[PDB]
Write a protein that binds this ligand. Structure first.
Ligand SMILES: NC(=O)C1=CN([C@@H]2O[C@H](COP(=O)(O)OP(=O)(O)OC[C@H]3O[C@@H](n4cnc5c(N)ncnc54)[C@H](O)[C@@H]3O)[C@@H](O)[C@H]2O)C=CC1
Lengths: 494, 494, 494, 494
């Protein structure tokens, strides 16, 4: 029972954002934006392509020039702007929470309580680091005085998905701006609206023109323009592994720009006999079914000891049947829609393979409703390692429960995947928890919990689930360029 | 592989060490050094007093002068000397292990396998840090370029006890020399010999004269001279809390020199129901009975759940009766003597109080042998909080086993002490281990183990068990002085 | 031309602050507070003694209990309260700036532009660190999992002077509270008012009761109670070296509490031939004459090359004669009064010694006015090393200008002092600047500037000018206690 | 006058190195290795291709398995092996110095004094970090205990050039092995011999089989196999920018392996009026002409103030004419040959363009000798920005001297390049040095020096001169994978 927007929501910002002003698309074309729940068109946004990006890049490069406000400005002041921006987002919390819920098909409660809270907390965390990005002074051999500067890199192209459009945005700009970089953000073609509102707040907060630029458009057009641009120093991507390979490839052909990928995963869970079953069942459920299972950190594969396998499956099903599919703005709705028809069809396709390959359908396993892209909360059991649903990322409300007996084997089964974004370990024994977590090849390992991401902790992936960390102290290292200054002196003294 | 010294050991270095040369005592007086096992006199060492210290200090200050070899020398090279010294100690491992065992009354096996191994590992660890003590460059407000230098402090007075004369020495000089400090070491009046041999190796390794100086003597004479000296920048102490208060007091009256104390403790152990009893019993036993219980980290108070109290007491006693008291140079002797008659009498005094105050004597509880200061391995049970043996540090082979029922209470009972050097937690549950360890007010908390100190981990104490950390990354911070250099510039750029 | 307080200032908070509520003095006695300019009594504040401290300590200890709001509260939230407090101070900026100016005898412009700005910036800096105080995970030898927690120490007694009552307060509480400590602050007997107003803002900001406690009183009474208290874990002092020695001494006799001193200095300046004389003259002037030269970082001794000695003296005098002594609230007044009659008499005493010992009085050199403790801006030249004015800290508007010829000599002359809080180097040559700054034994060395302190840079002193750093990353290390948790595991893997 | 090898050098190790044993090429084919000075064939080495790499990778992966010696082994012990290896290289210093000089066409004195010294120093530096690669413990929001492990990545493919075959090798394996990675090294097709000898020392030092593997072969064959291999986690490259783009591209198509590039540069020098001309001339000369100008950090473009332009050119020429081209093993020879005919022709081609495009040839400008690939030390003056010799990397003994007048302009001219590996600033003014160095877009900036690389300082490049740092504290961050372990607890306490 949360406060809803008193007025009716009325979209305003639907244009390209360069030098803290609203540009039209160079082509003049505009793409539509729909509510995934109602399939209704909300508005049309300016369709950005290369020409638009080239403008944004030249604005960002100009803003990054030596002697510009952004470079000369105090580190403390950069954080002050980030902290003001957080306050502006907190002010327009109902507006954004509503807009995110409509556009992203995201439960309003989650949108208000998780996403908007996450944006504020993270921005404020990032504000803190601004004037705490310190270099080093090295006691080098010889009569020399050596010191390093953790400078900003420069123009950073930043590509975000549709699953958490706001949170994902702050994860990009927050660290980047804190370190003193200028950014060219390309939001998803599905979910540009939320980001564009923030662009207005960035102007209002008083960020120098060109520091933040936002170019809404399609992936192959605008996104490719960023990945291959010759004056972009870094690219930051979050999306399918398929595209991540094109981003890194296009970065190689262009100007060897720096790369941070945050790709999807088939994140496994291991539930040993000695485990709080309710804890494990609830967190594993939340892990895989959060935001219609449209999380990179989805608890896809859930390995369970034989002794407690049947009991786990029993509880996981009854929990999954207590969902009410409908409009995310509607109070009482506990599950929302998929983003678009592409995911909808993909998820249903993998659900069919689960049946065809002969996994036991415990519940769900089909679409819901005439209107909207709604998928029933599905649960598969007796799943094998060589099934499509136990290999490919689903990115929908589908849970796979699998049994094990040997601890050594299940760890190797869990690690047997090109992905490795996260994992979950559920046990009371310390030795087990520490050793298992050390063995698992995951970027973030949760013990007796799941999906616990915060601003302070660094979040990334092993193998083909990422190419860098995004948060915490270590996340800031990848938005800086380390210059080494070695000065000759007459005599050195320790 | 326990090789014993083929030849009979013959002492050589028994003199004051200043400017890498052997001085006599200014007074001319000499104190004796006995074997605690046989009570035989080994030799007489030069008795250092203030005049001797004043010489050592002026040598150290000279060696620390701006432009001296030690200051100009590369950071890498300081580590190279430390690493060479470790190799020299490894060469003379049998010589030192034998000498330590004779002088310190220390089991030869432990002396060879623990102490000598510890000296080498630590020196080599400290060598590594030499050229990795880096400062910072601050992104300060205004048009300024700020940077910090983690310089050495200067002349560091270093006072060591008798329990681990070698290991304690390396813990002082290793970090100190790595950071580029000069040291004036005062070894214990009981155990100077081991340290003096190392002094020869420090010369052989090619340390500049004056960098390391060693002044063997008595505590109130030489030790007080160090604590109150007007040209000593830092003092590093390890001994009784009684004296620690005099060191800090004398530092206040003199020149506000920096202080790091490493005092004794009444370190408790908490053994919950869900614990590997054999693991707990063995580590708790080792904790309290290691080196005749002459460790600062002795498991004095051992709290046990009611359910497993009697069983724990049963196993702790049978383990304690399997000791063979005798000469520590005999390899199948499993327990050695106390250092001197002072400790011997003190330990017996506290054992009497245990009986008088009405604690149950399970085994031991009396002296052993005609010759040597040997105390029987004693075990008390049904011990209360307001007993002398449950409050005062014994520093002898005496174990106190106590029962609890409430987890919240025993934690407060454990913390209810002015000491707080270490603690021990024995449980299988993670939540318990983490929470209990967080609650306990101890410098080092061991989970399902005890007495596990290494070079990499920082070791110190809460409350009146210490005033600083000595090892690891953090231990080096206390042998450095941070200079801040702020340079005015025309224009700043991030 | 600054905004002045529209209303007339009316004091309100004049009582002891414990558990976020206003207590009376246990004795019932009250000490007066005067305006140093007019010698008028402003009000009377409750006089705190031991009984009052013992209350405050028990409130702080209660607030630091395991499970209390302050301990359980998120690190991010501790910073949020600190950031709110900064906003509250920014709101009541005119109120505090006026109150500080009246009570402290501080130029309103400086009070508003420097002090109040400094309080906000520092609090906001300290807010940032709250959730960025990270421990370590050590790759220790053996099958163990080691990690460290940078916990808060606990109850921290904090003693502040009268020169910058607000700024000095924030330098204490800011880092302390950020790390999660509870504080018992004792403000100066001269300048309690400013601190007490902030106490109201600390309540308003919503800090848990007992976290911050303020006990105004006299030094030997309340201050001694803190220094020797048996339940205070740390003491933080800033004042005379005389008392610093009593603080450390009383800490030794009590409970070996941790100590950070920030004492006075005889901070020297070295001005080489190749220097922007106007830059050097202006900064050296500002250095020694800021806030009536009542700074710990006062440019007492100013060494100048022979070639430019006479020219420097000439310009330093004409600058010093352009001061208008009067009420600091009066517009146009460029210099204010000394804090009390004690300093007034001390400063005049040292001015007499300058004449008696035969230093050339260039200007000033006497008192001013019938009312108020005003000293004329004095300048001495042809000053020698063995003069009282070239040794003892004056803490008044008196400048000593001295000549040199050898660079090596003047460095040794500069270092020839028990003090070493700061220094100043004025040259165009890099080699010179770096080498000289490396040679000087000062906590903060300014190059072609002076008195440039910020929140980001760590500020302390060498030798008898301090016992720790207060700001920056390193300043926070001294408000934390490092717990080491070593967990036994079955098998370790890198 | 250095000690030369007493015996005649006789090659032994000329085979593929997998699991610490000598394999033949799967194909059976062998490529020759020539002395660039004499053009004589030294020997034939086994020609590695994919099949050989696939073997090496599977050996490395096996050695990296959880529970293997390399993973379980103590961090301290990994450094001990690295330190032993350094000692073995120091023992075989004359052997390697001679072999490097013969194979690499490298001045014996430089080979012995620089390269072999560099290998030892760096290995020993890297040994130090082994047990000092610490993670963090985050004070995360919520009741959780978060900690990070800086684990090794895994199998690291490492590709080295021919210019400094030994030093470049240690820069790869040293950090990699210290962090606990297994490596598959591919040495240059020109210079495999030196690396293979070290492989014998790696066995002798007692590194577990499979930890280090070396596969000599051609770039497009073996190198491409590494860059596109599906079980290689990281690739580390050092060579032409041309190939760097293929490495990153092949990494995108394969398994999104991590990438660190260390490409060439057109590193500029800026010499202001106020500069020690002899210092500038000597360092700028050394910078561009070191090892026949076959350094990535070559001082290609040398900008000089108008006032001192002619004088600089005058001194730079007379210095360049004092070179004696011949066999690098011959005493008195001051310049050696280029590596192969490819570089030889390329360098001569660019020298022709210098004449054709109308740059003033001051000296040299043509080949030397009938035998060997010797190029005359060439100097161009009156060089413009749009010349081939002022844009393309030459990688030969050719110096370009250019004039400026505006400081602002020359900085933009210096930064106007896709390269940015290093730079050089020569001035006495501090403000100038700091500001200019801050403005320049170079990975390493030298002030009043050039080519001063050490193990402690991190070395890399901006823009298209690199994709990471290789040395110092920061260099180790790129041979680690950060796992985040978040544990749910009942109650959190700070
Ligand atoms: N760095 C500085 O601020 C310098 C201090 N002074 C001032 O000169 C006066 C000399 O009187 P002192 O009693 O020496 O003051 P002090 O030097 O200790 O003054 C600093 C503050 O410490 C506290 N304090 C004073 N005496 C104390 C004691 N015995 N134990 C614990 N805390 C104590 C009081 O709150 C006082 O305002 C003070 O007003 C002092 O502030 C003189 C020279 C330099």
């Amino acid at each position: 029972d949360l406060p809803v927007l008193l007025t009716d929501l009325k979209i305003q910002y639907t244009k390209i954002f360069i030098n803290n002003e609203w540009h039209d698309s160079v082509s003049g074309k505009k793409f539509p934006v729909f509510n995934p729940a109602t399939e209704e068109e909300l508005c049309q946004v300016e369709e950005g392509d290369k020409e638009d990006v080239d403008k944004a890049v030249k604005a960002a490069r100009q803003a990054f020039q030596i002697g510009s406000p952004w470079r000369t400005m105090d580190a403390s002041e950069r954080g002050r702007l980030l902290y003001k921006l957080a306050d502006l987002i907190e002010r327009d919390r109902l507006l954004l929470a509503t807009m995110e819920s409509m556009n992203g098909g995201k439960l309003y409660s989650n949108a208000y309580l998780s996403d908007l809270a996450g944006c504020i907390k993270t921005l404020r965390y990032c504000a803190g680091w601004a004037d705490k990005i310190q270099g080093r002074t090295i006691p080098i051999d010889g009569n020399f005085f050596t010191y390093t500067r953790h400078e900003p890199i420069g123009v950073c192209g930043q590509i975000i998905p549709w699953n958490f459009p706001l949170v994902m945005l702050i994860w990009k700009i927050g660290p980047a701006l804190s370190c003193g970089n200028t950014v060219v953000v390309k939001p998803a073609e599905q979910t540009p609206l939320t980001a564009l509102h923030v662009a207005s707040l960035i102007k209002e907060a008083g960020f120098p023109p060109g520091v933040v630029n936002i170019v809404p458009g399609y992936g192959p057009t605008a996104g490719a323009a960023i990945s291959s641009h010759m004056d972009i120093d870094k690219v930051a991507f979050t999306g399918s592994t398929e595209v991540g390979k094109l981003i890194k490839e296009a970065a190689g052909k262009s100007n060897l720009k720096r790369v941070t990928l945050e790709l999807g995963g088939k994140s496994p869970c291991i539930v040993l006999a000695d485990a709080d079953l309710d804890n494990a069942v609830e967190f594993a459920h939340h892990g895989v079914f959060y935001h219609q299972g449209q999380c990179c950190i989805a608890a896809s594969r859930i390995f369970v000891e034989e002794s407690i396998y049947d009991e786990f499956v029993r509880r996981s099903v009854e929990r999954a049947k207590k969902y009410i599919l409908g409009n995310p703005l509607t109070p009482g709705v506990t599950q929302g829609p998929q983003i678009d028809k592409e995911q909808y069809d993909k998820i249903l396709d993998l659900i069919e393979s689960g049946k065809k390959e002969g996994a036991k359908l415990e519940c769900g396993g089909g679409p819901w409703g005439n209107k909207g892209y709604f998928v029933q909360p599905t649960v598969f059991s007796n799943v094998t390692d060589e099934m499509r649903i136990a290999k490919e990322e689903i990115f929908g409300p589908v849970q796979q429960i699998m049994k094990f007996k040997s601890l050594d084997d299940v760890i190797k089964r869990a690690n047997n995947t090109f992905y490795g974004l996260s994992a979950g370990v559920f046990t009371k024994d310390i030795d087990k928890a520490i050793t298992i977590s050390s063995a698992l090849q995951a970027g973030t390992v949760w013990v007796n919990c799941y999906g616990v991401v915060s601003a302070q902790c660094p979040f990334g992936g092993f193998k083909m689930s990422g190419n860098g960390r995004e948060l915490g102290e270590y996340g800031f290292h990848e938005y800086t360029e380390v210059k080494t200054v070695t000065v000759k002196i007459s005599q050195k003294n320790s």
